[PDB]
């Protein structure tokens, strides 16, 4: 089935992405603490709810948080400054905190129930965020022998996420704080320059744009 494309709110980042983040894909944003990964997640959680002629997918959101970094007040701010009702935008975000990596994994199966529920309604789930994809795995699988074990478990988790993306036509968006293998569809390196400015580059994607997008963190989420 045809893929959909969720605008990020930045024309520059959208161009780098070929129009926006894709459904039937896992997009991983990675970078140092403070690089804006969670700001992009918040922004996407609002943008996906817009109609398609405004860069959204009329979609609902599911959000798995591992760092207590979801901020309903930030969603409210972004929504209001984009002409939307903040309470309605919040209503269409289903939120869960993952206690540990095994619970994080189970929450993917839990999520499929709501995905199925909403599928043939006018606001199907179109975005699934995992923020942070890796933090619990880092803390739990550590020391001699852990590289192989951690990579296996993370790959299984990502396979489960790919299945949801592909079976239900969902954009999966995941964050990673940074020679290991990765299995996301597309990896975007983010870094902070100065003030509210951020720079994005696609990694290991030689067939797509080789430049860099630049954007600012604003009351609308992100903008050129």
């Amino acid at each position: 089935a045809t893929i959909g494309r969720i605008s990020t709110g930045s024309k520059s980042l959208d161009k780098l992405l070929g129009g926006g983040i894709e459904t039937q894909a896992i997009t991983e944003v990675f970078g140092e603490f403070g690089s804006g990964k969670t700001q992009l997640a918040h922004t996407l959680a609002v943008m996906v709810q817009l109609p398609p002629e405004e860069g959204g997918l009329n979609g609902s959101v599911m959000w798995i948080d591992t760092e207590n970094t979801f901020r309903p007040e930030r969603i409210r701010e972004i929504a209001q400054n984009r002409g939307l009702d903040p309470d309605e935008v919040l209503k269409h975000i289903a939120y869960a905190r993952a206690f540990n990596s095994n619970h994080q994994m189970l929450l993917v199966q839990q999520a499929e129930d709501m995905i199925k529920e909403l599928l043939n309604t006018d606001r199907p789930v179109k975005l699934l965020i995992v923020d942070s994809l890796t933090s619990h795995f880092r803390s739990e699988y550590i020391g001699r022998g852990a590289l192989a074990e951690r990579q296996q478990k993370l790959a299984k988790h990502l396979a489960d996420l790919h299945r949801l993306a592909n079976l239900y036509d969902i954009a999966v968006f995941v964050t990673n704080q940074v020679i290991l293998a990765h299995s996301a569809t597309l990896r975007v390196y983010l870094r902070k320059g100065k003030g509210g400015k951020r720079i994005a580059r696609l990694i290991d994607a030689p067939h797509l744009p080789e430049g860099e997008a630049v954007f600012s963190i604003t009351e609308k989420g992100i903008e050129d």
């Binding site: 289903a94 939120y95 929450l107």
Partner: peptide
């Protein structure tokens, strides 16, 4: 999951 719960609504936000």
């Amino acid at each position: 999951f719960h609504t936000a």
